[PDB]
Amino acid sequence: IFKPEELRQALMPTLEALYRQDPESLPFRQPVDPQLLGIPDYFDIVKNPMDLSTIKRKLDTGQYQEPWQYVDDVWLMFNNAWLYNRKTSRVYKFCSKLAEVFEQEIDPVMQSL
Ligand SMILES: COc1ccn2c(C(C)=O)cc(C(=O)Nc3cccc(-c4cnn(C)c4)c3F)c2c1
């Protein structure tokens, strides 16, 4: 049992750290519209889409009752971009940097909960 405001307080700074990354977070700030991006085969590969705005809205309303529910949403977001994008692409590289950032922020947060 974590009460919702404690979870928000502990985890929100970890989402803030990602969101503030410029230019790396930009492709992750909103859902991927595959037709407007000219990538009409996106949902045939990526089965469960996730992005920072979805993660923020769920965290804002208290949908995450356990820390693991939040960590898993963030790794789903990362894993989706690593799957669809080539290892030599701008987007792939942006993804990995964000993850490096996330791991620094998240480790101590999990160690003291
Ligand atoms: C980092 O420094 C600044 C300084 C000022 N702004 C402002 C405004 C309007 O002044 C919006 C933003 C801002 O970044 N808004 C925002 C919010 C969500 C998504 C984007 C965005 C832009 N391109 N993409 C792909 C996503 C976006 F630009 C911003 C950032």
UniProtKB/Swiss-Prot annotation:
Domain Bromo residue range list: 2-109
Residues spanning the membrane: none
Region Interaction with histone: start-end pairs: 41-87
Posttranslational modification: Methylation of the KIX domain by CARM1 blocks association with CREB. This results in the blockade of CREB signaling, and in activation of apoptotic response. Sumoylation negatively regulates transcriptional activity via the recruitment of DAAX.
UniProt region (Interaction with ASF1A), positions on chain: 79-97
Localization of this protein: Cytoplasm; Nucleus
Assembly information from the UniProt record: Found in a complex containing NCOA2; NCOA3; IKKA; IKKB and IKBKG. Probably part of a complex with HIF1A and EP300. Interacts with GATA1; the interaction results in acetylation and enhancement of transcriptional activity of GATA1. Interacts with MAF and ZCCHC12. Interacts with DAXX; the interaction is dependent on CBP sumoylation and results in suppression of the transcriptional activity via recruitment of HDAC2 to DAXX. Interacts with phosphorylated CREB1. Interacts with CITED4 (C-terminal region). Interacts (via the TAZ-type 1 domain) with HIF1A. (Microbial infection) Interacts with HTLV-1 Tax, p30II and HBZ.
Domain writeup: The KIX domain mediates binding to HIV-1 Tat.
Function: Acetylates histones, giving a specific tag for transcriptional activation. Mediates acetylation of histone H3 at 'Lys-18' and 'Lys-27' (H3K18ac and H3K27ac, respectively). Also acetylates non-histone proteins, like DDX21, FBL, IRF2, MAFG, NCOA3, POLR1E/PAF53 and FOXO1. Binds specifically to phosphorylated CREB and enhances its transcriptional activity toward cAMP-responsive genes. Acts as a coactivator of ALX1. Acts as a circadian transcriptional coactivator which enhances the activity of the circadian transcriptional activators: NPAS2-BMAL1 and CLOCK-BMAL1 heterodimers.
Disease: Chromosomal aberrations involving CREBBP may be a cause of acute myeloid leukemias. Translocation t(8;16)(p11;p13) with KAT6A; translocation t(11;16)(q23;p13.3) with KMT2A/MLL1; translocation t(10;16)(q22;p13) with KAT6B. KAT6A-CREBBP may induce leukemia by inhibiting RUNX1-mediated transcription. Rubinstein-Taybi syndrome 1: A disorder characterized by craniofacial abnormalities, postnatal growth deficiency, broad thumbs, broad big toes, intellectual disability and a propensity for development of malignancies.
Protein name: CREB-binding protein
Organism the protein comes from: Homo sapiens
Whole sequence portion shown: 1084 to 1196 of 2442
